[PDB]
Design a protein around this ligand. Sequence first.
Ligand SMILES: N#Cc1ccc(S(N)(=O)=O)cc1
Ligand SMILES: N#Cc1ccc(S(N)(=O)=O)cc1
Ligand SMILES: OC[C@H]1O[C@@H](O)[C@H](O)[C@@H](O)[C@@H]1O
Ligand SMILES: OC[C@H]1O[C@@H](O)[C@H](O)[C@@H](O)[C@@H]1O
Ligand SMILES: OC[C@H]1O[C@H](O)[C@H](O)[C@@H](O)[C@@H]1O
Ligand SMILES: [Zn+2]
Length: 257
Amino acid sequence: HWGYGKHNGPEHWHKDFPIAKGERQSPVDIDTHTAKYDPSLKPLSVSYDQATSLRILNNGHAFNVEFDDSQDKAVLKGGPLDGTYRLIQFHFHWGSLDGQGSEHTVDKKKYAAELHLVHWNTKYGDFGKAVQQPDGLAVLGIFLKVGSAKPGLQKVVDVLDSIKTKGKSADFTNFDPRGLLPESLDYWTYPGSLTTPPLLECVTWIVLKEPISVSSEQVLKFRKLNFNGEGEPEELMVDNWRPAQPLKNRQIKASFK
Ligand SMILES: N#Cc1ccc(S(N)(=O)=O)cc1
Ligand SMILES: N#Cc1ccc(S(N)(=O)=O)cc1
Ligand SMILES: OC[C@H]1O[C@@H](O)[C@H](O)[C@@H](O)[C@@H]1O
Ligand SMILES: OC[C@H]1O[C@@H](O)[C@H](O)[C@@H](O)[C@@H]1O
Ligand SMILES: OC[C@H]1O[C@H](O)[C@H](O)[C@@H](O)[C@@H]1O
Ligand SMILES: [Zn+2]
């Protein structure tokens, strides 16, 4: 199956997922000089005060923190979005070393990691139906740089030893995703895709300009996870990022002048 290694990584995905060479693939490089302020963007609303986290899962590619999406609790609205988008999960992509790990790049610069908060458009009723629609998903992307520790991340870090291998999960109730945000909600936005197979072209990307800082110790613990299952030869879960894809017939819009 697909992965990130030399033999099943991003350069191979197109053989089973031909949309990998499609017209609005993600991630992309964000050229900050060509991005244009867009006055048509409405204020962005990240409304996570009633979020209900449930569980954390090592799925063999990353770890997902899953939320109750059975009703409107944690939602994302405004900005480029038409309607209400419910938070379903978040996960990260990261590197083997601090100089790489992000999926999006900013003027070609790679960050140490990238957080994706994944939301689906409630007009479509369920996630599976949303991923059959051009505007089915919205992903809020946040860059991580290494510096001071992020207190709102430490609970995540500290549970990772209990989900080291593929298929392991743990209870992860009462986690507040608001502690993962930076101060500013300035962002870039463009239409794109899932960055992992099945690579579906359903996503409105909203990428925050301000990174969060995490400590070296925090990201080092991400890198102790395993891609493999229990009992199998250890393959450290590192470099689980897709490189930037061609922009093609797209423009990146900025929320800020
Ligand atoms: N054996 C094998 C194998 C290699 C690559 C992939 S792909 N196209 O999903 O990256 C799948 C299976
Ligand atoms: N199913 C699914 C799925 C959800 C989000 C993403 S991402 N890396 O574009 O946020 C990838 C796959
Ligand atoms: O426990 C994590 C978070 O869960 C939410 O449902 C609560 O309303 C918040 O007050 C709390 O910070
Ligand atoms: O035709 C002019 C228009 O070109 C488009 O490509 C830009 O997105 C708009 O901002 C601009 O007003
Ligand atoms: O908030 C997420 C998790 O943080 C810590 O692991 C707590 O001990 C646990 O009870 C909680 O589920
Ligand atoms: Zn992702």
